[PDB]
Structures are given as structure tokens and as C-alpha cells.
Amino acid sequence: TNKIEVLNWEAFSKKLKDYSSDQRQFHVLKLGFENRLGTLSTREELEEFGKNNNFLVINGKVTQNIHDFPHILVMNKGDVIAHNEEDYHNQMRELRFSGNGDLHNSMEPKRIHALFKIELDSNKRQLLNAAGLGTAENSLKNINGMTIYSHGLTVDNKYYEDYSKYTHNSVKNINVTKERFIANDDLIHKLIESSEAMKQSSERDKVKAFVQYVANHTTYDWEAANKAVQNYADINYYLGSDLFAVTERQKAMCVGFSTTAARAFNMLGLPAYVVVGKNAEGVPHATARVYYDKKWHTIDGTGFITGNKHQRSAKYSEKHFSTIGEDSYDVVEAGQEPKAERNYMIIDSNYESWAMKQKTADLLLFNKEKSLVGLDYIAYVE
Amino acid sequence: NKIEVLNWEAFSKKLKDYSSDQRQFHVLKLGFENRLGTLSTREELEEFGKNNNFLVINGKVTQNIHDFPHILVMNKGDVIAHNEEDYHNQMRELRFSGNGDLHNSMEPKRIHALFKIELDSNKRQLLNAAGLGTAENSLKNINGMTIYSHGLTVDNKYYEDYSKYTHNSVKNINVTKERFIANDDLIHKLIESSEAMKQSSERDKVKAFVQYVANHTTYDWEAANKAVQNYADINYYLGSDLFAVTERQKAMCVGFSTTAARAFNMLGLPAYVVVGKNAEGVPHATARVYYDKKWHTIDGTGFITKYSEKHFSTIGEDSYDVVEAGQEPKAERNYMIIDSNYESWAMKQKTADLLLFNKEKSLVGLDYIAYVEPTYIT
């Protein structure tokens, strides 16, 4: 009866070149999945599918003619094809748990397939659910002259997919490569360009311009900030706070804003670092400290959060006009305990005295070339 | 001073040579202030050898630190500076975590030395100003000689925070049959402790178990509150899966219901897990459980930040309207979506078969059928 060969991309590609040399695009079906894995796929994209899938040849045929278009059949590398009924029933005798798979590297749900009808019925799936487990759903594909049936082989925690989204989000921003970091520095450079900060005369107006631009093109993450004030554990806090938040994600919280700003200011020859303290409403906050016009300043790049105002005291007036809230924080020295509990930033004066005297490009530590003021400029004078 | 770095094989050779009598070691890992192992065996040392190499200092394989033998290890990948210049070369250009081959692992690497090396506060302030971090300065004084360590690779400064999410996301999936069986054992302990088997009637077994579990498991009100705030949260899954009440000892409705359903099938009380809305109109889950000739809705969700007998009677048992799979609820309040055809099928099964796996952990053996209820008066 019907034969099925399982080949990898190398072997399959050979057969493809023999039986379909003129064919340039292919649809691709993956056994166990509703939608095409690929539509109008090229041989390069086929090869890419070959990393996680093997290819099927059925009765000598490399493709299935479906609505007059060649379809390639693939399946997950750990899947099994039951040869006959006896084999299938051997295979389903005992629940097969995901963690006991031989190949350690791939423990996503495996499937079993057969040219005869196989399924796991709603009763068995209800019992799996009753043990907190899940397993891939029933499905089939009608092809040329036969039908291939599929369903879960391994059982696992029924929340596997939900969890695995957290796996992905938890790793996509760590193990950062030098390439990733340089590309981010490019994103910052582009923010600097778009802000037109370099077109400003004074250093102060450079700051103003960049801060206002970023505030006008980055979403503040109200939800995550909300959950963070009620110290509720949230991966979104980190996604809004790290070096990729305003640049890649375009959605950020205070630490994100302040880190992107500090990086940008150092590029612009304006000695900067990130500080933390508390809101004028007592809630934990973060800002940048930036050196310009002979002084270290507190710059709050997220000055739109608090609906409630608080004036006073006079140093020396509101007439010292700022439209980015320059130096509106009290400062607390690193080490010293905060004597108040609102409207302070914890600064480090030794570091500030040190930083203002360094070559600004050195302050970048790495990728020093992206400095916009060369490699020798020092902000401090006399 | 001489420091030599050995994998577990070679080090085991030398340990056999010089410390055969010692069957337990404490284990210090360079760059870490706590011990890595406490009274570790050679088994556990071998496990340590998967991600760490072993230090041999001036020929010695073991150290007397507080009148007990200690072994020094360090992460594979960590580097040793031999002199000031060598140290400068290693540090000359930022080393990013993701640029190791490695092939494994990609955890922060550290650099070590027998002379003073540190990443001072200035440098860490600049790293911080880049959104970057690296391992802390650290120190071990072994026997008059001092081993200095600090971070070597740099990465996203939230590396540790993200990695807790990585860990929590994978620790409960790729479940092994051994893990599943051990979870069944945890459930058995809950049953024993609940004294449910020592009750006379089915209803009392159900009440005892549900009560005990709801009284000895933390209800995760935060996760629940955020779930009704439709704020995506890994803690929902941690409070909902099969390890929630058993391992985590902290759960929401699906967790309580799933553990209870499993226990009831073990106890010979046909059970499955159903969803719907509680009396407030918010998404809830319960267990449907067969006993006393009827299918019942059992809501065993706890309240501890006491689940009483009154609560069981008025809320825990049969307090929901049932709606058939496929049908619309009367209001969006106080209903559970059941499968009547499934209920009819399951109640006639050998209850061990309802467990699908680890059937020998059935507390009523292999032949128990709940549907056997042959007289009217009971």
C-alpha cells in the first residue's frame, strides 16, 4: 500500500531538482496545522523550513497537486508516523510525557500521524484537562488519493504555549550581542537627528529639544507604571525600563526614558548618568543628571505623569523659566539617607565631579565613534 | 601561587587521591558570596561539574575554611588574569554576553585574579548609563591568599530580573513522567492530611478534602485581581496549573479545581474541570464531581491571604446554575459550562481509567465504579 519517506532538506532538495526543476515557488503544508506553513515559498525558504522539519515523499512524489499548485508536506522533526494500526496502538498505550523525549533540544509538543484514521476523542481530552495536561489537537489533510490524520503524541502542562510566550519575552532582550548594542546606538542617533538637537545653539536647548522629542514620540506605559506602584511583579516593568524600551519598543517608563536620554546626552558631549529617587508625590522615580552650562542638572524626561502641582520654595523664582522642569528636584547624596521622602534624586557628587572632567566619548565606554563631538572633547573648562 | 582549572573528570581523579575519607564537602563558587553546595556528595559535585570547573590551588584539591573541607569552583567560561597587563587586555574592550559561541551557557562570565581587581563605582555608573550591567566585585580569602573577582561580560542590566521569568516560564513545562508521578504523591499527601478517607460518606470525603486544601493553600488574590483587570500575568498560569496548589502552595480557581479533580478521581469520585462565572459575574472555574447518584458542582477555591462547613454547603456545593456546552447562560452570573454526555460516560468508567496514567495511585484500586448504586435507600 502507500509508502511515505521522511527526508531532510539535502536529500529532498535533490529529489525536488529531479522532479520539479522548473518550479520556483511551492505551497507548504505542515502536518497537524490548519494553515499553510508557507505560501509561494522559494527553495531558500524551504531550506529554512528544513531546520525544524523533515520533508515527506509519498509514493515517489515530492509534491501534492492541490488546486493546481504544488504543495510540499513537512512535519516537526520529532513527530512519528505510525506504520500500521498495531504500531499506533503500541505508541498510544501509555501517556508519553514531553520531558522524557530523547532529543533534549526539541520538547515542543510532538505529534503522531497515520494514513488510517486516528484521533484522541473529547472524553480522553477532558481527562487530560482534568490532570492539567494538554496534547496537540486532532487534524487531517486530504491529499492526492489519500488522507493523513494527526494528533498529539506527547502530553504536557496544558499552559505550555502561554508559558513559552514568557520564555520568549524573557530572553529576547538579554544575552545582548555587541551587534545588538551598536544597532540600538544607531536608533538613539536617529532619535538625536529627528529631535534636531544638534541644530540648537546652547547645550540647554539641545537637552530641551531631545527630551521633548522623545516625550512626543514614545508612549508612556501607564499600565505597567500602575502595577509597579502597587509593587506587583511584572515583566513589562523591565520591558519599559531597559535600553530597548524607547528605541525598539517605543513604549517606556521612567528608567527607559532616562537611560535613552543619558546615552543620547553623552553622545552629544553632555556628561550624563541615570539617577533614582522619589516623585514630588512620594512615588519612586528616575531621571537623568546632565552636565551643561557649568552645572549638573536634574532632567525629568517624563514630566507629564503627575496631575497634582506643588510650588515653592523660591530658588529663585518661576522666572528662572524652564519648559522641561530643569532642576526641580532636591538632591540627596549617595550614602546619606534621604531626609525627605518626596521630590529627591539620589545623586553621586564624586562621580559628577569626575564625569564632567572626562573626555565625553570615554563616558560612552564602547562604540565611542558614535560620539557627535569627536573623541577628545571635555565638557569641563578651566 | 599556582591555580589550575580542571573539569570534573580530572578533579575527581585528584579528589580520589587526596580526600577519599571525606564524603561531604562544602562548595564555594568564585564571585558568589553564599556557598554553592552544603555538605555536598561526589554525586552532587559531578552535577556541579556540568556548568563549573574546579580549582586546584597549590596542588590542593580541598580547603579547610571553617574546620570543614571546601571545594572551589567557577563558572565555565570565567577567565583568570595572571598579571596586571593580561588583566588590562581582557578588559580593554567591552565583552558582550551574546558574543560567546558558547555553546553553553550565556550567563554572566566573571574574571578572577590573585591580585586586587575591581570594576569601581565610576565604571559601573557608566555601564548603568548605558542600560548595562556586569557581575559585582567579590572576594574570597582562602588561606592568606586572596581571590578577587568581578564581572567580565556585560549585558542588559536587568539580566537577573528577566532570567527569573525565564526560569518560572520553563520550570513547569516539558513535564517528565517522574515529575507527574511526584505530583500525584503530593496530592496523596494532601488527601492523607485532609483525613478524607476516614470520613463515612462521599459528600464528607469531598468536603474534607476541599476544606483542608482551601485552608492550607494560599489564595493568590493579587493574580486574581489582575486577571479580572485583564492584565496578562505569568502568575495566573503559576496559580492555575497542576503544580499550583501542590508545589507552589499558592493558587487560583483553576489550580484548586484541577488538583481537586485529580484527587477525586484518585479517591474514586469521577471528576473533571469546568469553567464559567461566579456569583459576581467574573470568570471562575470549578470541578464537577460525581457522588450520591448525582453530578455536583464543587467550588474548592480558598480564601486565606478559613473555608468553613457553612461555606461548603451554601457556596462550595451545587451553588451554580449549569449550562450545557453549546448553550447560552441565563445571565452572565453564577454558571458553569458542563458536558452532560461526558458526565454520563465518566460515571460508568472504572475510576482508575479516569486517571489515564499512574493508575496504581488510585486509592480505590482498578475496579471501582461509582455508578454502582443499586438501592434507593443509602
DSSP per-residue string spanning B60-110: BS-EESSSSEEEEEEETT-EE--SHHHHHHHHSS-EEGGG---SS--SPPE
H or E stretch covering B251: strand B250-251
Query: A352 in contact with B at a CB cutoff of 8 Å?
Result: no
Rounded CA gap, A290 and A296, in Å?
6
Rounded CA gap, A198 and A300, in Å?
20
Torsion on CA atoms B19, B22, B24, B27, rounded to nearest 10:
-30
Q: Are B112 and B74 in contact, with CB atoms under 8 Å apart?
A: yes
What is the nearest CA distance from B270 to chain A, expressed in angstroms? Answer: 10
Q: How many CB pairs under 8 A join A and B?
A: 192
Interface test with A, best of B174, B238, B245 (most A CBs within 10 A): B174
Task: State whether B156 and A173 contact (CB < 8 Å).
Answer: yes
Q: Are B29 and B77 in contact, with CB atoms under 8 Å apart?
A: no
List, in order, residues 6 or more apart from B194 with CB less than 8 Å away: B208, B209, B211, B212, B213
- The residue behind cell 539641545 is A206
What cell was used for A55? 520533508
Q: What is the DSSP string of B60-73?
A: BS-EESSSSEEEEE
| Residue B325, helix vs strand vs coil | coil
Sign of CA dihedral A210, A213, A217, A222: positive
Q: Which domains does chain B have, with CATH numbers?
A: 3-163 (no CATH), 173-361 (3.10.620)
Nearest to A1 by CA among A145, A164, A112: A145
Q: Are A372 and A358 in contact, with CB atoms under 8 Å apart?
A: no
Rounded CA gap, B297 and B318, in Å?
5
Rounded CA gap, B52 and B131, in Å?
28
Rounded CA gap, A362 and A367, in Å?
10
Rounded CA gap, A365 and B236, in Å?
41
Task: State whether A274 and B172 contact (CB < 8 Å).
Answer: no
What burial letters (b/e) apply to A171-203, b meaning 16+ CB within 10 Å? eebbbbebebbeebbebbeebbeebebeebeeb
Q: Are A151 and A118 in contact, with CB atoms under 8 Å apart?
A: yes
Interface test with A, best of B125, B159, B264 (most A CBs within 10 A): B125
What cell was used for A297? 542638572
A357 contacts in chain B (CB < 8 Å): none
What cell was used for A231? 509593587
Supply φ then ψ for residue A138, to 5 degrees. -70, 140
CA A30 to chain centre: 26
Query: A335 in contact with B at a CB cutoff of 8 Å?
Result: no
Nearest to B158 by CA among A172, A365, A43, A179: A172
Query: B231 in contact with A at a CB cutoff of 8 Å?
Result: yes
| Residue B284, helix vs strand vs coil | strand
Per the document, the length of chain A is 382
Rounded CA gap, A98 and A109, in Å?
7
A158 contacts in chain B (CB < 8 Å): 241
What cell was used for B165? 521569568
List, in order, residues 6 or more apart from A144 with CB less than 8 Å away: A58, A61, A64, A65, A66
Cα B39-B42-B43 angle, rounded to 5 deg: 100
CA B372 → CA A187, B206, B227, B297, B369, distances in Å? 71, 18, 41, 20, 6
Q: Is B361 exposed, middle or buried (0-12, 13-18, 19+ CB in 10 A)?
A: middle
What cell was used for A39? 505560501
Sign of CA dihedral B11, B17, B20, B25: negative
Sign of CA dihedral B93, B96, B102, B105: positive
Do β-strands B218-219 and B250-251 pair in parallel, antiparallel, or remain unpaired? parallel
Nearest to B368 by CA among B207, B202, B196, B246: B202
What cell was used for B77? 567560561
What is the nearest CA distance from B193 to chain A, expressed in angstroms? Answer: 21
Please state whether the peptide bond connecting residue B102 to the residue before it is cis, i.e. omega within 30 degrees of 0. yes
List, in order, residues 6 or more apart from B308 with CB less than 8 Å away: B211
Q: Are B155 and B133 in contact, with CB atoms under 8 Å apart?
A: yes
What is the nearest CA distance from B174 to chain A, expressed in angstroms? Answer: 4
Query: A187 in contact with B at a CB cutoff of 8 Å?
Result: no
Start-to-end CA span in chain A (Å): 92
Start-to-end CA span in chain B (Å): 84
Task: State whether A365 and B126 contact (CB < 8 Å).
Answer: yes
What cell was used for A369? 565613534
What cell was used for B215? 485552608
Task: State whether B222 and A234 contact (CB < 8 Å).
Answer: no
Interface test with A, best of B95, B127, B152, B156 (most A CBs within 10 A): B156
**Strand residue runs (E) in B256-324:** 271-277, 283-291, 294-298, 321-324
Task: State whether B342 and A233 contact (CB < 8 Å).
Answer: no
Task: State whether A98 and B175 contact (CB < 8 Å).
Answer: yes
Interface test with A, best of B105, B158, B181, B226 (most A CBs within 10 A): B158
Task: State whether B173 and A160 contact (CB < 8 Å).
Answer: yes
Q: Are B236 and B216 in contact, with CB atoms under 8 Å apart?
A: no
Q: What is the DSSP string of B171-238?
A: TTSS--HHHHHHHHHHHHHHHHHHTGGGSSSHHHHHHHHHHHHHHSSEE-HHHHHHHHTT---HHHHH
Query: How many other CB atoms sit within 10 Å of the CB of residue A86?
Result: 9
Rounded CA gap, B152 and B31, in Å?
11
CA A375 → CA A188, A271, A379, distances in Å? 18, 13, 12
- The residue behind cell 460508568 is B348
What burial letters (b/e) apply to B119-157, b meaning 16+ CB within 10 Å? beebebbbbbbbbbbbbbbbebebeeeebbbbbbbbbbb
Rounded CA gap, A292 and A211, in Å?
14
Do β-strands A330-333 and A344-347 pair in parallel, antiparallel, or remain unpaired? parallel
CA A88 to chain centre: 40
Nearest to B30 by CA among B123, B146, B133: B146
Q: Answer left, alpha or beta for residue B167, where phi above 0 means left and psi between -120 and 50 means alpha.
A: alpha
Nearest to A273 by CA among A193, A206, A346: A346
Task: State whether B165 and A169 contact (CB < 8 Å).
Answer: yes
Q: Reduced to 3 DSSP states, what percent helix, strand and coil does chain B have, rounded to the nearest 5?
A: 35, 25, 40
Interface test with B, best of A125, A127, A290 (most B CBs within 10 A): A127
Task: State whether A263 and B129 contact (CB < 8 Å).
Answer: yes
Q: Is B72 exposed, middle or buried (0-12, 13-18, 19+ CB in 10 A)?
A: buried
Q: Is B77 exposed, middle or buried (0-12, 13-18, 19+ CB in 10 A)?
A: buried
Q: Is A346 exposed, middle or buried (0-12, 13-18, 19+ CB in 10 A)?
A: middle
Rounded CA gap, B244 and B258, in Å?
9
H or E stretch covering B111: strand B110-113
Task: State whether B177 and A95 contact (CB < 8 Å).
Answer: yes
For B169, the closest of A98, A164, A175 (CB atoms) is A164
Query: Which experimental technique did the depositors report for determining this structure?
Result: X-ray
Task: State whether B258 and A355 contact (CB < 8 Å).
Answer: no
The residues facing B321 across adjacent strands are B335
Rounded CA gap, A260 and A188, in Å?
7
Query: A182 in contact with B at a CB cutoff of 8 Å?
Result: no
H or E stretch covering B122: helix B121-129
Query: A348 in contact with B at a CB cutoff of 8 Å?
Result: yes
- HEC string of chain A equals CCCEEEECHHHHHHHHHHHCCCCCCEEEEECCCCCCCEEEECHHHHHHHCCCEEEEEECCECCEEECCEEEEEEEECCCEECCCHHHHHHHCCCCEEHHHCCCCCCCCCCEEEECCCCCCCHHHHHHHHHCCEECCCCEEEECCCCEEEEEECEEEECCHHHHHHHHHHHHCCCCCCHHHHHHHHHHHHHHHHHHCHHHCCCHHHHHHHHHHHHHHHCEECHHHHHHHHCCCCCHHHHHHHCCCHHHHHCEECHHHHHHHHHHHHHHCCCCEEEEEEECCCCCEEEEEEEEECCEEEEECCCCCCCCCCCCCCCCCCCCCCCCCCCCCCEEEECCCCCCCCCCEEEECHHHHHHHCCCECCHHHCCCHHHCCCCCCCECCCC
Task: State whether A364 and B121 contact (CB < 8 Å).
Answer: no
Rounded CA gap, A262 and A300, in Å?
11
- The residue behind cell 565606554 is A365
CA B292 → CA A86, B89, B195, B201, B374, distances in Å? 40, 78, 20, 9, 11
What is the nearest CA distance from B261 to chain A, expressed in angstroms? Answer: 6
Q: Which DSSP symbol is given to B33?
A: S
- Sheet of A330-333: strand order equals A295-299, A284-292, A272-278, A344-347, A330-333
Q: Are A178 and A185 in contact, with CB atoms under 8 Å apart?
A: no
What burial letters (b/e) apply to A90-115, b meaning 16+ CB within 10 Å? ebbeebbbbbebeeeeebbbbbbbbb
Rounded CA gap, B3 and B63, in Å?
13
Q: Are A256 and B111 in contact, with CB atoms under 8 Å apart?
A: no
Q: Which DSSP symbol is given to B361?
A: G
Which residue in chain A has the smallest CA separation from B235?
Answer: A233
A124 contacts in chain B (CB < 8 Å): 356
Q: Are A356 and A379 in contact, with CB atoms under 8 Å apart?
A: yes
- Sheet of B79-80: strand order equals B79-80, B110-113, B146-151, B138-141
Q: Which DSSP symbol is given to B354?
A: G
- The residue behind cell 566573571 is B110
| Residue B150, helix vs strand vs coil | strand
CA B285 → CA B198, B291, B320, B337, distances in Å? 28, 19, 11, 9
Task: State whether A177 and B272 contact (CB < 8 Å).
Answer: no
Rounded CA gap, B183 and B28, in Å?
32
Rounded CA gap, B286 and B294, in Å?
16
Amino acid, single-letter form, for residue B239: G
